[PDB]
Amino acid sequence: ASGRALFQYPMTSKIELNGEINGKKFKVAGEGFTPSSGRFNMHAYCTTGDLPMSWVVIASPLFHMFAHYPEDITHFFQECFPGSYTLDRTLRMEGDGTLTTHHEYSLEDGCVTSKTTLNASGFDPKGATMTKSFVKQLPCEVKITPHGPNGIRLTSTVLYLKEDGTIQIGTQDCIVTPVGGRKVTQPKAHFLHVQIIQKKDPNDTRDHIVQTELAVAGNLWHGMDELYK
Numbered sequence: 001a002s003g004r005a006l007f008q009y010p011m012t013s014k015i016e017l018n019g020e021i022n023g024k025k026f027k028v029a030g031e032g033f034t035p036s037s038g039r040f041n042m043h044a045y046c047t048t049g050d051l052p053m054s055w056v057v058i059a060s061p062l063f064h065m066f067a068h069y070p071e072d073i074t075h076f077f078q079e080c081f082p083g084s085y086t087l088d089r090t091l092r093m094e095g096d097g098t099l100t101t102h103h104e105y106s107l108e109d110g111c112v113t114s115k116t117t118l119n120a121s122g123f124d125p126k127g128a129t130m131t132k133s134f135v136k137q138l139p140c141e142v143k144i145t146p147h148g149p150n151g152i153r154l155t156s157t158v159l160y161l162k163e164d165g166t167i168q169i170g171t172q173d174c175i176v177t178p179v180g181g182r183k184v185t186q187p188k189a190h191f192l193h194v195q196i197i198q199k200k201d202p203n204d205t206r207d208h209i210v211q212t213e214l215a216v217a218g219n220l221w222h223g224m225d226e227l228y229k
């Protein structure tokens with residue numbers, strides 16, 4: 001049993017995230033539900049107190065294996081199982097700060113566990129990230145290309161909406177690397193449409209978020225694959 005045969009829905013998720021931003025250390029944990037292909041939620045909470053940064057900015061750090069892929073595009077993230085993959089992220093909030101994340105995953109009993117670290121240095125203490133002035137991030141297209149002999153790369157430019165109704169940009173670059181000591185067939189260049197919706201639980205006493213991601217793969221530009229050898 002490998003690849004897509006390991007991703008029979010419903011499934012669950014867990015996260016453990018150890019973070020630091022501008023010297024403030026924090027932890028998040030969460031549990032989530034993946035009812036069906038491409039629709040996955042996460043109820044995360046800061047176990048150290050208040051989260052010292054925007055929940056909107058930490059949204060993308062909070063599971064590409066749950067994306068919905070048509071049959072005719074390789075689902076690289078799923079085809080890495082068994083063996084798994086790492087994700088390395090750089091998220092540059094333009095004019096504000098840069099953060100990196102490192103993720104490791106394991107699959108057991110229908111549950112994907114993410115162990116993630118986040119490092120963030122030199123953010124503007126009056127920027128939207130540290131003052132928590134963001135309302136949401138807008139849906140984007142993530143460009144996925146083959147990267148080196150065995151990886152992929154994911155790039156996106158994300159619009160973050162502040163409370164005054166104006167936009168800040170984040171520039172996001174990820175490398176996925178199989179860690180299963182085996183070759184995984186690389187997909188053709190393609191795009192992922194991604195939307196995040198965040199809300200609060202009526203009762204939870206913790207600093208928390210209830211997040212849903214919709215993530216759908218598509219060959220949005222048939223000619224793009226020609227450019228990536």
Ligand SMILES: [Cl-]
Nearest residue numbers: 054055056132
């Ligand atoms: Cl927030």
Ligand SMILES: [Cl-]
Nearest residue numbers: 142154172174
């Ligand atoms: Cl990404």
Ligand SMILES: [Cl-]
Nearest residue numbers: 073074187188
């Ligand atoms: Cl493909």
